[PDB]
């Protein structure tokens, strides 16, 4: 059934406070969807740059959805409350979600869907490879790019005017 979706806007996800979010609220906004972790070598560069992008582009319509996951080196061990508190240290004002799995049979259906999209395909299969993979989503909820763990968020900035 998640296979039949054609837009991110068809999904819902539980935010970091335990409340459901209809992802259709991102309709008309360019969105970055990313899997985060607090204990990765690139935690700092990723959070800092995402906060910076959000601050500078939120008025142009940039939204950021951050999904914690503990699937990559067990680098997100904390509770949702502890992760929320960690994000607060970076002055995060974008949208934090409850911890999920992004690979395997229990992965969040959004993540299952993103990974098989025409412009969401991975390199070396479609599995998320490590923390801080980023998906760029257009104003219609279509996946338009996948950026790998090594591609810092500021790499995405040049692509934003292609979809604003």
């Amino acid at each position: 059934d998640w296979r039949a979706a054609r837009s991110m806007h068809e999904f819902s996800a539980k935010d970091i406070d335990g409340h459901m979010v209809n992802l259709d609220k991102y309709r008309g906004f360019v969105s970055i969807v990313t899997n985060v972790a607090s204990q990765c070598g690139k935690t700092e560069v990723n959070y800092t740059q995402l906060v910076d992008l959000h601050a500078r582009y939120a008025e142009r319509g940039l939204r950021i959805l951050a999904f914690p996951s503990n699937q990559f080196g067990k680098q997100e061990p904390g509770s949702n409350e502890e992760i929320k508190e960690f994000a607060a240290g970076y002055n995060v004002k974008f949208d934090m979600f409850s911890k999920i799995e992004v690979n395997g049979d229990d992965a969040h259906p959004l993540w299952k869907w993103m990974k098989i999209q025409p412009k969401g395909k991975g390199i070396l299969g479609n599995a998320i490879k490590w923390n801080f993979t980023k998906f760029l989503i257009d104003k219609n909820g279509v996946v338009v790019k996948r950026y790998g763990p090594m591609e810092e968020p500021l790499v995405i900035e040049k692509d934003l005017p292609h979809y604003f």
């Binding site: 690139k42 299969g125 490879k129 490590w130 950026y147 790998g148």
Partner: peptide, 14 residues
């Protein structure tokens, strides 16, 4: 430069 995630990941793909 050596891959900074070794040995947990070897920078293969995305």
């Amino acid at each position: 430069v050596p891959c900074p995630y070794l040995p947990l990941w070897n920078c293969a793909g995305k």
